[PDB]
Amino acid sequence: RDISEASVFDAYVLPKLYVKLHYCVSCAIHSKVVRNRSREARKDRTPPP
Amino acid sequence: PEKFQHILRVLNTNIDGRRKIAFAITAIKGVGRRYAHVVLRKADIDLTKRAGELTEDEVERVITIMQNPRQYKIPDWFLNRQKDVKDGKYSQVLANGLDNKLREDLERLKKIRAHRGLRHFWGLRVRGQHTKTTGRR
Amino acid sequence: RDKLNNLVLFDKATYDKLCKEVPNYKLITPAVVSERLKIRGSLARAALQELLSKGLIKLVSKHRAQVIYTRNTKG
Amino acid sequence: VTVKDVNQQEFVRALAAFLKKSGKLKVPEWVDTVKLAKHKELAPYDENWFYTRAASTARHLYLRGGAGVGSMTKIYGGRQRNGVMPSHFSRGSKSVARRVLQALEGLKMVEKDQDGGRKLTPQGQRDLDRIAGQVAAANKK
Amino acid sequence: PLQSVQVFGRKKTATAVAHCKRGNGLIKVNGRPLEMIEPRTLQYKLLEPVLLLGKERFAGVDIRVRVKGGGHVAQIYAIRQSISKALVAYYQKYVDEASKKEIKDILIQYDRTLLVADPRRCESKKFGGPGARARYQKSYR
Amino acid sequence: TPDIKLFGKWSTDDVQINDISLQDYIAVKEKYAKYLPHSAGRYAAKRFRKAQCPIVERLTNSMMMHGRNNGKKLMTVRIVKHAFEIIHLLTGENPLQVLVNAIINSGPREDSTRIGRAGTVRRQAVDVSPLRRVNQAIWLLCTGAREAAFRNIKTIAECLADELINAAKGSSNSYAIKKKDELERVAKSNR
Amino acid sequence: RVQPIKLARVTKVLGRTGSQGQCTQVRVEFMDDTSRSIIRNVKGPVREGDVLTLLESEREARRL
RNA sequence: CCGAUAACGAACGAGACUCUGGCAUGCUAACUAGUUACGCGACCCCCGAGCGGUCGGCGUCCCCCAACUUCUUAGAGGGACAAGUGGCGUUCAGCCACCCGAGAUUGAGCAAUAACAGGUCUGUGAUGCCCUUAGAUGUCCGGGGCUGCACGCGCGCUACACUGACUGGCUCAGCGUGUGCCUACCCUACGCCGGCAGGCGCGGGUAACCCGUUGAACCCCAUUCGUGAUGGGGAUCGGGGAUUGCAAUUAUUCCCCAUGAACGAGGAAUUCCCAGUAAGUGCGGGUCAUAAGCUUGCGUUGAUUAAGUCCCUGCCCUUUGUACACACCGCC
């Protein structure tokens, strides 16, 4: 909303960065991308928000 | 308010004029605050004044009294020297005199091979407090 | 470092200033004479009653401990 | 305007004056060389306690119907440095409170009560608080 | 027949029983008016009820308080609380209620526990500490 | 005084909280201008009842500190009903304005809080609830008047009545307004 | 550059972050301007209703 | 706890309980409380006001066949129960704010399973075994030591001063405690004497009666002092005098004199805790012939600040890894 004021143009969608991050498992765990589950849970491969 | 005295010398011991009169008497060995008003109460010196004031008569009035106390009604509390032992004299020792008396009674105890003497000789406590933890110099 | 040794009794020249200089303050106490002037403070204690000879200065209110002691009373 | 109605601390100021300006009570000799209570460090400055303390003691008896020497000692207390030790409570001097009572007895401010203990007598009851009128009516301040 | 309302207010262990009789009404603690007592810095402290409600409000009310127990300062919110409570029970029981409520308002708009007993009292000591809570210092290697 | 609740001798009316934020936290008078700074007190029970306690008494308590003097409010209540009677001589007007327009500009506008920040502890700029300003300000001038008054014989009433004027005015001549500077100054360095 | 003083109090207290539990995160109305919304970490005990002060009106203090 | 729920309904711990601590002009009462205020009948001195009527007030003259419980006491009671309202909350369990008011928490004791070469044989006439057993490690007398001192650490107190130091004064308790006790022994009121320690006189006391309106310190109020290692501080010694004890040498304890130290806020670290809390402050109790710088209680004066987080330390669950199971102070 700073930028949408100062815009010379009207409305304007703004772009997006499309980064494909891409971690080794070490950093995936250390930096909390995944975690570490129970034996029954290890299997449940769905991706749940 | 008369600044003339600029300190005073009394009884062979240096003393300070500025200090209040009761306090000034205090400095000499054998005195203390107790006895040092009582001297200035019999002498009838006004206590509200500084030892860098007064006259020669006042300061001698002190010495005559303090050196010879018992005769000017001063009772026998305020004799530091109570039944001396070397004659049954009971008076008030002052100046180096007490250092002399002090030494003589240490000497006497020591000479009579008695415990308290030995303890000064060695450099210890005389008064049986425990020296395990204190008395470290 | 704070060492502050002052004469027990005001000198005549000094006394005039106390007679003189003391009219030129408001918030006075045995402190304000013994730091501005070099008076002991017990003789300041004393001087401040002397200076009630005819209220050269004014008592707001002597609190048991602290005199608390104002300007002359001009206007 | 009884002893209470007068602001009690400027009572004994004037009652000390009374017994001075009478010129009788019976001041004695342990006086100039008195400690006051082993309690204290140092002999008191106003050289004239017992005119001002016999004042206290005598008004005190006004407030309380009976009081022994043991009582007077108790009341004039304090803390007492035994030094590096903690402070404790030491009774005042008996001798002095006693002779204060006995001396008040000379003027006949007080008397020995029945059932032990001193109280003040009607005559003294007066001299005491007569001046209460004079202290209130010295001026309003 | 006059009033004879007794009321107490407390602080710690300082029971102070006030009582209100009808008369000229100039108020006093034990046997001395409010102008003394002489913690003194306080003073206004115990005058407050007077100074709030009006010098008129005790103008038909001789109040006499008595105080034992507790301590120097406590004894004062004890006697304050008492001559506000007592004065409250005065205008309630025989006089009216509106003035009782105008009083109770004037007081409880700033309490200072005027009609409300301070519910508090001291904790006990527990072993292994100088006070209630604090503890004798832990040695530790 | 039945007309209006004054303060030993003192007007608490014609007193205004001269910066909004501190207003509603400085309880000079809700309608409640207390006469004295002794009070039963129990503003340490809940949390934001602490403000509703009057800045004056709240200062007496903040003054009876230091090891040899804790719980001598009788004592310090003198100092403070004794100090103000100095200010009015110098400034004039309610010295309660000199108290209140001290605490306002004795205490900052924002402060430097310690975050953990891994190892090297880079404090963070944060604003404050008028509390760490109010309180710090309060000792800083207590501590200041205190520290100035060991080894001169300065009356704590005098010493404090310096500070309260030297902080009522942005006078840069006290102890409170000399640290109110730095906490801001330290914060500026951080950001 | 830009150097004003703006006083705003966040409408809702939000959390109590900081390492040791210091900083209460606040969403604060500008006050000087109604429209502006900022997030800052405050040190003193705050609440819903109370004005606060920040040196720079930009920083928008983030996760700490 | 509810709920999701291969579980359903139970048991110990927590909780409930006990003691305690606070609202109870609500009740039952109380000369071993208080009393209260009377009625005030007085003495009563001008104690004080006031010409005098009248009044303010301590004390008493009480007693009582006043009257009563206003505070005191201790019995029965009640209450306080997230009880109401407004938020927040899966709109459940609850949480938060406010009302009336003690707002749901005033503080302990009690405290499971299961542990631990924790400690205790020197608390036990509880004691296994072992030693020792007359010259006795059986029991003691006298003395001595347990106290000793170049150093090291541990809990305390007092200071560093003037928001204070010593000099007048005023004046507010609580929990206790007390004799006359299992073998010889107190609590102490009031007279003189002495400065004081104290001494010497005499009085009440199975005590809510006597100590004892427990008459305190801080505290509070009245003067000195002037920031001087000074009047703070107050050690170490000189000398007297009391007291306990048959006896204090190995200063017993106390007093009276006399000397008169380091410390001007503490280097590296680290415990304590949120409301009547920390701190100061005496005071009891315990310890006691003598006696406490010890603790445990008690008020009293009474603050600052957190009201949250797991950042350090250490605890709980869950998932997980684990070559550890004398458990990482491990294994290798």
Coordinates of N, CA, C and O (backbone and C1' of nucleotides) in Angstrom, one line a residue, chain B residues 105-107 109-132 134-135, chain H residues 145-150 236-238 249-251:
Chain B
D105 N 52.9 -3.5 82.7 CA 52.0 -4.6 83.0 C 52.1 -5.8 82.1 O 51.8 -6.9 82.5
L106 N 52.5 -5.5 80.8 CA 52.8 -6.6 79.9 C 54.1 -7.2 80.4 O 54.2 -8.5 80.5
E107 N 55.1 -6.4 80.6 CA 56.4 -6.8 81.2 C 56.2 -7.6 82.5 O 56.8 -8.6 82.7
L109 N 53.4 -9.2 83.6 CA 52.8 -10.6 83.3 C 53.8 -11.5 82.6 O 53.9 -12.7 83.0
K110 N 54.6 -11.0 81.7 CA 55.6 -11.7 81.0 C 56.7 -12.2 81.9 O 57.0 -13.4 82.0
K111 N 57.2 -11.3 82.7 CA 58.2 -11.6 83.8 C 57.7 -12.7 84.7 O 58.5 -13.6 85.1
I112 N 56.5 -12.6 85.2 CA 55.9 -13.7 86.0 C 55.4 -14.8 85.1 O 54.2 -15.3 85.3
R113 N 56.2 -15.2 84.1 CA 55.9 -16.4 83.2 C 54.4 -16.8 83.0 O 54.1 -17.9 82.6
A114 N 53.5 -15.8 83.1 CA 52.0 -16.1 83.2 C 51.5 -16.0 81.8 O 52.1 -15.4 80.9
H115 N 50.3 -16.6 81.6 CA 49.9 -16.9 80.2 C 49.7 -15.6 79.4 O 50.4 -15.4 78.3
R116 N 48.9 -14.7 79.8 CA 48.6 -13.4 79.1 C 49.8 -12.7 78.5 O 49.7 -12.0 77.5
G117 N 50.9 -12.8 79.2 CA 52.1 -12.2 78.8 C 52.7 -12.9 77.6 O 52.9 -12.3 76.5
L118 N 52.9 -14.2 77.8 CA 53.3 -15.1 76.7 C 52.5 -14.7 75.5 O 53.1 -14.4 74.4
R119 N 51.2 -14.7 75.6 CA 50.4 -14.3 74.4 C 50.7 -13.0 73.7 O 50.7 -13.0 72.5
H120 N 51.1 -11.9 74.4 CA 51.5 -10.7 73.7 C 52.9 -11.0 73.1 O 53.1 -10.6 71.9
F121 N 53.8 -11.5 73.9 CA 55.2 -11.9 73.4 C 55.1 -12.6 72.0 O 55.8 -12.2 71.1
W122 N 54.2 -13.5 71.9 CA 54.1 -14.3 70.7 C 53.4 -13.5 69.6 O 53.7 -13.6 68.4
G123 N 52.4 -12.6 70.0 CA 51.6 -11.8 69.1 C 50.4 -12.7 68.7 O 50.4 -13.4 67.7
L124 N 49.5 -12.7 69.6 CA 48.3 -13.5 69.5 C 47.1 -12.8 70.0 O 47.1 -11.6 70.2
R125 N 45.9 -13.5 70.2 CA 44.9 -13.0 71.1 C 45.3 -13.3 72.5 O 45.8 -14.4 72.8
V126 N 45.0 -12.4 73.4 CA 45.0 -12.7 74.9 C 43.6 -13.2 75.3 O 43.5 -14.1 76.1
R127 N 42.6 -12.6 74.8 CA 41.2 -12.8 75.2 C 40.8 -14.0 74.4 O 40.7 -13.9 73.2
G128 N 40.6 -15.2 75.1 CA 40.4 -16.4 74.4 C 39.3 -16.5 73.3 O 38.3 -17.3 73.5
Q129 N 39.4 -15.8 72.3 CA 38.6 -15.9 71.1 C 39.4 -16.8 70.1 O 40.6 -16.9 70.2
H130 N 38.7 -17.4 69.2 CA 39.3 -18.5 68.4 C 40.0 -17.8 67.3 O 39.4 -16.8 66.8
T131 N 41.2 -18.1 67.0 CA 42.0 -17.5 66.0 C 42.3 -18.3 64.7 O 43.2 -18.0 63.9
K132 N 41.4 -19.3 64.5 CA 41.4 -20.2 63.4 C 41.2 -19.3 62.1 O 41.9 -19.5 61.1
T134 N 39.9 -15.6 62.3 CA 40.3 -14.2 62.4 C 41.7 -14.1 63.0 O 42.3 -15.1 63.4
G135 N 42.2 -12.9 62.9 CA 43.5 -12.6 63.4 C 44.5 -13.0 62.3 O 45.5 -13.8 62.6
Chain H
rG145 P 42.7 -26.4 77.9 O5' 42.2 -27.3 76.7 C5' 43.1 -27.6 75.5 C4' 42.6 -28.7 74.7 C3' 41.4 -28.5 73.8 O3' 41.7 -27.6 72.8 C1' 41.3 -30.7 74.7
rC146 P 40.7 -26.4 72.5 O5' 39.5 -27.1 71.7 C5' 39.7 -28.0 70.6 C4' 38.6 -29.0 70.4 C3' 37.3 -28.5 70.0 O3' 37.2 -28.2 68.6 C1' 37.0 -30.2 71.7
rU147 P 36.1 -27.1 68.1 O5' 36.5 -25.8 68.9 C5' 37.9 -25.5 69.2 C4' 38.1 -24.0 69.3 C3' 39.5 -23.6 69.7 O3' 39.7 -22.4 68.9 C1' 38.1 -22.7 71.3
rG148 P 41.0 -22.0 68.1 O5' 41.8 -21.1 69.1 C5' 43.2 -20.8 68.8 C4' 44.1 -21.7 69.6 C3' 45.4 -22.1 69.0 O3' 46.4 -21.3 69.5 C1' 44.2 -24.1 69.7
rC149 P 46.8 -19.9 68.8 O5' 47.9 -20.4 67.8 C5' 48.6 -19.4 66.9 C4' 48.5 -19.9 65.5 C3' 47.9 -18.8 64.5 O3' 48.8 -18.4 63.6 C1' 47.0 -21.0 64.1
rA150 P 48.7 -16.9 62.8 O5' 49.2 -17.2 61.4 C5' 50.6 -16.8 61.0 C4' 51.1 -17.4 59.7 C3' 50.3 -17.2 58.4 O3' 49.8 -15.9 58.1 C1' 51.7 -19.1 58.3
rU236 P 38.0 -8.2 69.2 O5' 39.5 -7.6 69.5 C5' 40.6 -8.2 68.7 C4' 41.8 -7.3 68.9 C3' 42.5 -7.2 70.3 O3' 43.3 -8.3 70.5 C1' 42.3 -5.0 69.3
rC237 P 43.3 -9.1 72.0 O5' 43.2 -7.9 73.0 C5' 43.9 -7.9 74.3 C4' 44.9 -6.8 74.4 C3' 44.9 -6.0 75.7 O3' 45.8 -6.6 76.7 C1' 44.3 -4.6 74.0
rG238 P 45.4 -6.9 78.2 O5' 45.5 -5.5 78.9 C5' 46.6 -4.6 78.7 C4' 46.6 -3.4 79.6 C3' 45.7 -3.3 80.9 O3' 46.4 -4.0 81.9 C1' 45.4 -1.3 79.7
rU249 P 39.5 -16.1 85.2 O5' 40.7 -17.0 84.6 C5' 41.9 -16.3 84.1 C4' 43.0 -17.3 83.7 C3' 42.9 -18.0 82.4 O3' 44.0 -17.7 81.5 C1' 43.2 -19.6 84.2
rU250 P 43.7 -17.0 80.0 O5' 42.9 -18.2 79.2 C5' 42.3 -18.1 77.9 C4' 41.0 -18.9 77.9 C3' 40.2 -19.1 79.1 O3' 38.8 -19.4 78.7 C1' 41.4 -21.1 78.5
rA251 P 38.0 -18.4 77.8 O5' 38.5 -16.9 78.3 C5' 38.3 -15.7 77.6 C4' 39.2 -14.6 78.2 C3' 38.7 -14.0 79.5 O3' 38.6 -15.1 80.5 C1' 39.2 -12.2 78.2

